[PDB]
Amino acid sequence: RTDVICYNGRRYELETNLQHRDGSDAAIRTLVLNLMFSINEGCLLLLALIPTLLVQGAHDGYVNLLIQTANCVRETGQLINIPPMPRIQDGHRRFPIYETISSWISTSSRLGDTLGTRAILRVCVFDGPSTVHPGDRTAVIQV
Amino acid sequence: MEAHLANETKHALWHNDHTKGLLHVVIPNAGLIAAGIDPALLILKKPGQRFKVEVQTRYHATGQCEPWCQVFAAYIPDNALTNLLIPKTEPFVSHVFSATHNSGGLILSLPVYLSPGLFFDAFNVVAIRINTGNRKHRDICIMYAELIPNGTRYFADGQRVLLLCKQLIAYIRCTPRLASSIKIYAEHMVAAMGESHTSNGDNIGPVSSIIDLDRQLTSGGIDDSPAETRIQENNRDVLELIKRAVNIVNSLMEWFDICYAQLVSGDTPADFWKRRPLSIVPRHYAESPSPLIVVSYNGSSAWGGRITGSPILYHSAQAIIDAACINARVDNPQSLHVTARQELVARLPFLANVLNNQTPLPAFKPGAEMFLNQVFKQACVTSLTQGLITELQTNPTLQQLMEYDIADSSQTVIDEIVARTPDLIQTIVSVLTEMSMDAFYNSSLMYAVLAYLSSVYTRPQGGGYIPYLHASFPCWLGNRSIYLFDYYNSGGEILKLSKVPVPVALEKVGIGNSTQLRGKFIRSADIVDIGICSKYLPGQCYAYICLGFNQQLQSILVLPGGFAACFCITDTLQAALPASLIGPILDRFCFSI
């Protein structure tokens, strides 16, 4: 600013409603925080490996599952620096891959905690099937 | 090699100010034998000293100076060549390769000037500061001619890698392990290097492959210059046309890298640059038989690198000067024609500041600090002795005046020293031409005198005089807190006895009338190497002579016997030495933020 869902032949309708900007500031703050926490030093190395990646994937078969949705990723791949192989300050106890994967894990955990509602409700069915049906009565089981 | 590589990111991030180009320079440690110090305390031993090395420039009759450079390095003993050439294999260290008794090495940062107007000459001396004893520091001083010799060794490095690769191949093949695939692919790679070179010649040919530096540091200085390349290509074209006329008329390491990574399972910074040709820029001297090997990166467009074309040659700055000098058959450009002077000014913008005769200085002596400080110390000592002798001649009263803690049975010899004051002053005067001048040329007195003058003439353009670190800490606001006492014997002969002065506390009791002096002491909990000379009682075969000085160049006599003279020599130094003698001092010892 600044629908139809199909599942097993069933269509679900929704009605959106957005007329206030009280949460727009929070949304932009959290998205900019996620963007700032997501950038790392491995992106340059990943972008500097597109020819090798496409060569490896030419005889792999797992290409359509990414190119059916990566309509702009391929276009933006050639619009980057593509630097040559850099030189690390030390080659004994340096590993940016570990740092970037740790940062990604931390950010994923943070976003899962922020977007995850705490609800300790794990029921356990007995005898009958676990699937519930509209119009039946069940019990409460605490785990 | 690790600290310098880590610190290289600061130079890498630099984009503007191309007048400071950092490069890797290796300084051999062959000259450390004459240092006379302990090598153990030079790398890692008793941390706290914080040894640092600074690099500064020295101009000539132009003014200003470089604001130093915060750099540091560490040495490496026990055959540093073996661990810097052969890849690090500490977990599986064995009897690999063969070499003689090697030595250590060091890396020093030296900025270089790169610009369209390169220019080259020998008129600047690089000063290196070492945080060691000022007595015989064993430093070096070279001009800019040795820094940029305009040469590189690109052909001699090819054979060095061949011996190492042959040795490693032989070592791999000598052990019967792994599988036959490695052997067969190594054989295929060897055969791929030549048809008749291996099938009809030899595969490896160890013969007499001994790791030594015989033809590597002797020839190959000027071999890849553009003129040499043109001559070589002309010769190759001539040979090709000769071969054509004779004919007409008669009458690839990918597998090796993978296997090395699988076997060694360890990387060192001295392996990535082995795949590309290196550059060697040695600069030896007769002072010590050790070449100054210089290594330059090949993957960057730095000085000496050859990755895109012709590197920096430092040309177009000598032919014009030679033509101007030979036009009138006069070497000195000062006595040349007006047209020659105008041409020199136009071609060399930096040379226009010498023709106008600005900031006059006698001749061109960059190394003037030594004898300048010697002359200043001699003048200060002569002024001090003149003041003390005049005050002694005009000294009122007689014998002792105040109490003085003197034993009853020891006072019979105290007056003997006082009665021999003319003999003492005569000996002091006469010793100026007999005592060695190498014992008081780098003491704390000259440093304190130099720091005292920092208050006056705080740069022609201003400055707060705020150093960062490693500066005159005892002399910051006043010299009345820390004193410098020199102990000398009595009689007809005076010679140096102590080694390092120790401050002695002093206070006045009486607040008027006959002033009294009674020294005190301050308990210190930071050092234990303190002499007991200062704590010695006034008795016990008399005592020494003390002459303290404050921050106002005021000397108070502490001679036992009830004699005390106060004279100021702050105005005598200015009268004898004018303000034109502090030119180099202000040029060098100045800093601003």
Automatic annotation (TrEMBL), chain A:
<protein>
    <submittedName>
        <fullName>ORF41</fullName>
    </submittedName>
</protein>
Automatic annotation (TrEMBL), chain B:
<keyword id="KW-0231">Viral genome packaging</keyword>
<dbReference type="Pfam" id="PF04559">
    <property type="entry name" value="Herpes_UL17"/>
</dbReference>
<dbReference type="InterPro" id="IPR007640">
    <property type="entry name" value="UL17-like"/>
</dbReference>
<keyword id="KW-1048">Host nucleus</keyword>
<keyword id="KW-1188">Viral release from host cell</keyword>
<protein>
    <submittedName>
        <fullName>ORF43</fullName>
    </submittedName>
</protein>
<keyword id="KW-0426">Late protein</keyword>
<dbReference type="GO" id="GO:0051276">
    <property type="term" value="P:chromosome organization"/>
</dbReference>
<dbReference type="GO" id="GO:0019028">
    <property type="term" value="C:viral capsid"/>
</dbReference>
<keyword id="KW-0946">Virion</keyword>
<keyword id="KW-0167">Capsid protein</keyword>
